[PDB]
Symmetry: D2
Subunit: 198 residues, 4 copies
């Protein structure tokens, strides 16, 4: 059913901002484990649902949210990065950022603060509030996906799990966040943003 | 396909301990609301599981645990009560209570304490730890079902949601728990216990 | 030492929207219990804080958030209602509602859904986002306070705990929600609103 | 005011099980960040507590549980490890384990599963249920302390945050777990255990 998507760039394409070892491991080991367990949990849920086992379906929720979210999160993350990214977004998105956060630098601080703030494992997200018609920064615990738990549309996600920066930046999460702005695929983020107004 | 089970006694069978209006509204309203929304959520889950929409499967979880657990919880509760109940259990159920909690009265206080202790909506439970082979008391938030969220198999449940006592005992929950001991179907919990030892 | 604030109107001043029985018990019993538990909890906290007992401090956390929250929430709640209430706000507040939700009728529908959506015990809130300079609807579980857990400034609160409406509306929360609009002290909300733009 | 307890052995005393860099960074940087943010948080809480600001008290909670728990957890953790440790405990502890888990090798699988099972950041714990006079295995999320959030008295803890192994064992948590059994200070646990039957 579910597959591990190919990275749209090589492992060391985000150097030095994100090394090739973090990239190789994060993709081929972490994301891959998510994709597998998701398939197995999804099939065990199918059997339970068809059998009317409500207890089982409920006992499988944690594994489904974790591995499902893990696959949703990482898939979006790969597309959010790029060796040709960085700088500031172009077009409407940069303008929407001006409205909702004041300026690009203010947006940068806020999302960096939401990411640095995650106590434990989690993600920092720039999303879109469909009901409201504006952008919205949000953080999520462990592998809880943005849309499935808040209804917000993911535009730019920054993984702040220790596995996404420890081998290189160690305990200095702030340095990791500062290095990632250099490899942000703004063309992708503007794609997802434009796809919302639809 | 799930259905609202009938009560093994009529609406005013638990007087004066639990009034007919409570019994009637609890079963015909709350429980009935749980079974329908559960069926709709499952059918909605089959549809998303068929399109591999992980986001949909996850945005459906709260409704499934809430309504599904609501259904599991109350179905057990109904059977746990009886117009011929009260007193104390017999045989090895009583012995497992003495061994695990010291005495019936100690067990009473413990389950009463756990039930009186839920802040907000919840359930106080007496379950069986199949792993360790013994009785264990637990408390659960809202409609979180004992087994699906904790692994313990439910034997005796006590609904401490305000809708299960307010119209009668108002804000004095400990008076409800004092009264509930009189209509406890120990025959049903004994059976529920014995099925764990098989 | 916290004190139970006096009601700014007679226990029956909100009829036939929220019967006098509910208002009497809700204030004199429910709200009273929190105030009292909070005073006992803070007292116990100053003791653990002094001894550097991090364990007791953390152990007292649920009790303080629950009781401290019950007091914060209801204190604001009583000030949100009025015998001379109902209708629609005007000027600065009605304006701000229109920009953030479109119309007053939409604002109502949105706060009504957020409040009805609460599974178990909780509240529906109209708050203000100081960082974003605009309004924002939010839902809080159990007695978790708006400002203390979401960081938003409380503007209008509507208690959806079952004790807040059950005796009059039974299990139909929507009716309670439709009725409560008739006693809203908009004069108070705008003042809370002005304090944010202050 | 709290302080970083001196490690009872040098950073490389747990090699090849736990490398010198993990130990180095873990104690001097991670555990250090906790004691400091705790001292900041407490001071701020005694401040807010003094004014009776229940909002600030509640808003400080996550930071207190997080940092206070981080200080409590790691302080204990350092004692649970020793270069001259490993093997099996003896006397009353081994018997307790045999009785409450079947055998030592069974206890290990159990404490290993709880630890491997935590999704995201957390800890696996072997504790003591003073209420039931027996050993109990619990898992705690993030820095949530055992006794403060569970009541169980801590006997042996296993940090399963990625920073506790990722630098060495990478994505494979099971390896860190197989290895940690080698440097476990079964003399310290026996002491903590004997302190429970006091
Ligand atoms: Mn990751
Ligand atoms: Mn109920
Ligand atoms: Mn209330
Ligand atoms: Mn650690």
């Amino acid at each position: 059913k579910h597959s591990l998507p190919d990275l749209p760039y090589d492992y060391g394409a985000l150097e030095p901002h994100i090394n090739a070892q973090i990239m190789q491991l994060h993709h081929s080991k972490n994301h891959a484990a998510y994709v597998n367990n998701l398939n197995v949990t999804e099939e065990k849920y199918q059997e339970a649902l068809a059998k009317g086992d409500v207890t089982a379906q409920i006992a499988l929720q944690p594994a489904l949210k974790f591995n499902g979210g893990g696959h949703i999160n990482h898939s979006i993350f790969w597309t959010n990065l790029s060796p040709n990214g960085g700088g500031e977004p172009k077009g409407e998105l940069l303008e929407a950022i001006k409205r909702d956060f004041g300026s690009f630098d203010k947006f940068k601080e806020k999302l960096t603060a939401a990411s640095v703030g995650v106590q434990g494992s989690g993600w920092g997200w720039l999303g879109f509030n469909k009901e409201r018609g504006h952008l919205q920064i949000a953080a999520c615990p462990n592998q809880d996906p943005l849309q499935g738990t808040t209804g917000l549309i993911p535009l730019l996600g920054i993984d702040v799990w220790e596995h996404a920066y420890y081998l290189q930046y160690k305990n200095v999460r702030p340095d990791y966040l500062k290095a990632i702005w250099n490899v942000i695929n703004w063309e992708n983020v503007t794609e997802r943003y434009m796809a919302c107004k639809k």
